[PDB]
Design a protein around this nucleic acid. Structure first.
Ligand SMILES: [Zn+2]
Ligand SMILES: [Zn+2]
Ligand SMILES: [Zn+2]
Length: 279
DNA sequence: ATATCT
DNA sequence: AGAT
DNA sequence: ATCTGAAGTAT
């Protein structure tokens, strides 16, 4: 059983995310629990929480089918102490909002070294940030998303993900989400079934599927190994439709949120339908 | 710096 | 991308 | 149709 959806808008209230997901016949969904471009947000109200839970129940979205995404401002590997602490506090709040909403997963990008510290140093800070958040919360798994490798963003190599996991104390609450556009942009080919086999065997050897908690299904406007993060609708990008059919036919991607972050929301219902039909 | 993306 |  | 304000890619 596969859970297929998209990162829908939470405008007007978190419950609206569940409503919008149901509208496109999604069996999974992602969302921001607050403005992704602002540091502070009003505390969740009992009404917002209840309406969200009610909507999730009404449309059959269990926590295993929802993959919230954290703010874009957070840098869990920031080289400057003040900024690192600010990011950590915000991440803790993000995890706590998940707790309050009955969610069990939180997808986030690792962090960036900003050319001020070593890769190893940065990865260590990220692992510690996760350890701190896990010590302050319960029931929420920190899901590390791989990245395209733009600028000083880390997490573009599977080895980075493995290194962070190695530094996390409570292995039961850490995992990863693989974004196909990011992987492709970072140099992991997905243009043919054979390349997909190779790329995921690499993932298996380095990270291990036991840690896979979600997928972001995005084609790529950017090119192979370009290290540029630009999404595209399925089949219209440089990856092509083969990779997505392959993923839908592989049982290793069962029981986790498979999230579209494609650029034309007006065809999400159709993209979801197509993905389902590939199984 | 401006526009746009994630 | 969400609030106003 | 403007803020918010990390990090980054083009221009
Ligand atoms: Zn992401
Ligand atoms: Zn993504
Ligand atoms: Zn992306």
């Amino acid at each position: 059983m596969k859970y297929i959806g998209a990162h829908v808008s939470a405008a007007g209230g978190l419950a609206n995310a569940a409503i919008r997901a149901a509208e496109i016949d999604a069996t999974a969904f992602a969302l921001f629990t607050k403005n992704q471009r602002q540091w502070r947000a009003a505390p969740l109200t009992t009404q917002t929480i209840d309406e969200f839970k009610a909507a999730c129940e009404k449309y059959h979205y269990t926590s295993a089918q929802i993959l919230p995404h954290d703010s874009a401002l957070i840098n869990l590997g920031h080289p400057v102490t003040e900024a690192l602490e600010k990011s950590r506090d915000a991440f803790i709040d993000e995890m706590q909002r998940c707790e309050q909403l009955g969610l069990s997963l939180l997808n986030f990008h690792p962090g960036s070294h900003l050319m001020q510290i070593s890769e190893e140093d940065c990865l260590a800070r990220i692992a510690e940030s996760i350890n701190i958040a896990l010590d302050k919360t319960q029931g929420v798994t920190a899901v590390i998303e791989n990245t395209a490798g733009q600028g000083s963003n880390l997490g573009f190599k599977f080895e980075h993900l493995a290194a962070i996991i190695d530094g996390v104390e409570d292995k039961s609450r850490v995992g990863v989400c693989i974004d196909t556009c990011h992987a492709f942009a970072a140099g992991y080919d997905l243009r043919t079934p054979a390349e997909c086999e190779k790329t995921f065997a690499d993932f298996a050897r380095t990270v291990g599927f036991k840690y896979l908690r979600g997928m972001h299904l995005n084609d790529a406007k950017s090119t192979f190994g370009s290290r540029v993060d630009r999404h595209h609708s399925l089949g219209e990008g440089n990856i092509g439709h083969d990779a997505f059919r392959w993923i839908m036919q592989d049982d290793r991607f069962d029981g986790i949120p498979l999230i579209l972050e494609t650029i034309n929301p007006d065809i999400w219902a159709e993209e979801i339908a197509w993905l389902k039909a590939q199984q």
